[PDB]
Amino acid sequence: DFFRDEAERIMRDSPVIDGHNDLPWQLLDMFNNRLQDERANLTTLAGTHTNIPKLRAGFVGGQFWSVYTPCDTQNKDAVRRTLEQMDVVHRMCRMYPETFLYVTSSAGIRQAFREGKVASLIGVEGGHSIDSSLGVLRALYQLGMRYLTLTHSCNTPWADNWLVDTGDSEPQSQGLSPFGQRVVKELNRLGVLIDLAHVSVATMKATLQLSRAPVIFSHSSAYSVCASRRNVPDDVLRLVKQTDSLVMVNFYNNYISCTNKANLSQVADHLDHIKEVAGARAVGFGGDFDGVPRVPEGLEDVSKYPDLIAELLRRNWTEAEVKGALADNLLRVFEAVEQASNLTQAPEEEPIPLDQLGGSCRTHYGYSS
Template identity: 25%
Template sequence: MFIADGHCDATLRQFEAETPSFTEGMTITESSLREGQVNMQLFALFAPVYDERADLFDAVLRQVDHFYNLIVSNDQIEFAPCTPLTETSKTRAILALEGADGLQDDWMKWRLIKRLGVESVGLTWNESNALAAGCMEEQGHRLTNKGREVVTFLRNEGMIVDGAHLHDDSYFEAASLSDSFFVSHANSRTIHNHPRNLTEEQLQVIKDKNSLVGMTFFPKFINGSEEATFADLLRHIDHIAGSIGSDYVGFGSDFDGIPQSVSGLESPRGILNLIDYMQKHYKEDDVRKFAGENYRRSITNTLNATQTATTVNDLSQLSKIKRNCQRRCVHPLRV
């Protein structure tokens, strides 16, 4: 079974550690990925916006350095940007950027992270920046002019826009301007009302884009407490799969970025236990989709879209999705 996890903060933990490692001291390690039989792991580069003293782009580059020196250099890891996902004994690493505060609209920096192998970009963390509104802002807004330029760059470069952490209005516009769009780690706002979770309209965008949302294992986003069970997590999966279909759900653990996790899911090793539990509640085909096949399909679609986005059919579909998303933007534009 192909197993994929759409989000972790391992490189941030390495950046913060006195002695960076990929073998100990973290949740995501070479052994935990191997024992959990994880075939694809997305590694997020995070600019520590909560640290006023930090040079944000320097922090991103240092995490890239750890990614190459500690993770990619490991025999367990395969790093082959912009190529199809295959099921092997190794873990395919995908590099992502979570929050663009360290880049803003500096095109040299954007070209550099593309050349370094970044395939997915989230425009914000929880707060707003010069590009977009973050999900924790009470008064949100659509993308700024700079934000639209960045999304256009990402589209032209065949990169994926990650809607996690975006305020609702920025989310809809980012989706409307993107060829490839997904949400790496979030759950259902209907099941638990938290700004980091997705509304029904946001979930419909995932279906419109033929993409997916990765279920995060953070109890605070599952039920609002510090503890959660497999059953609690499955309530989100049940709802989303029932609302938009089983083709649009995956995993987005947020390991190494969360202080608590679902009981039994404290590391990638626990994913096999989750799959065993899911097999008692879902058809085998759906379990395979949730575990990783939906990610494999989504990545394949991204590769195909990069090659064919200029065809008449693709442009027509993009225009339809854009109109649907624009109708959902309710706050006035701020730049």
């Protein structure tokens, strides 16, 4: 097919930079992070949407590996598990240096491309990973964190999640609390991409107005095509365009077709909508592979990407528009976030108020007057 052949042509020069893959979660749940276990060899790994040959076959040259710890680890062992999940990614890149190239910069991604290696970055999914600490946040940054999904499927003491918009979770901060604002301010100062996937609409809006740099939705689709609260509504998409942000499309069937069954065409519909409402420089991929149970027909795994690009081409997307959805838009936003960073600027050090910290798993040293 001409279009599939064209997809591959463009992809050899502009590999796909995906914004959210939950393989590290699989490595933990399946092998307790024991990478030397034989069933855990990534060149032969089966039962997952991802593995080395599939990444190569799908022309994936950059991946934000999701460092994820469930919501029930908040106020428990969220910080410890986050560090473990960051460790497995560090190790994965050392065990397979011929494949993965661990990076923490926009320039690093371009280097991986040059070397024919899959750029591997870390994306921390959920604000509960920092346990309301600016110091943990700075520690994660040093450990490689390059994007922080403010929340996951649960409220933090300083940011509300999407379940607030479905009625399941009660609005706590109604967007960002004053400490949440300092978190956002610290993220900008550090040069960490602010990810708005999983947050409530109030938080999306609060952060888009507040953030000094372009934000992202690492794995979110269009609310107009599928009315999921995990999806981005049109008024927000207009904020996305206004700020020159980025929305990285999620392939999960239930966010694509709003039902269990979905296909490659419906995913292209989401990409088309975002492209008209938010503009072409606001579209990207954040498949959510290995994080979701159901993936689209035609988009079974990480090797199916070229087929999705062929469809875009079939639909008359220009080469510039697809290359932008492939890697360029992410690189634009990443560079912006880096240019907006100011490390010589005094870090945020005002802790969250004690009355806002939660759980029965902490001590109160430092707090007094």
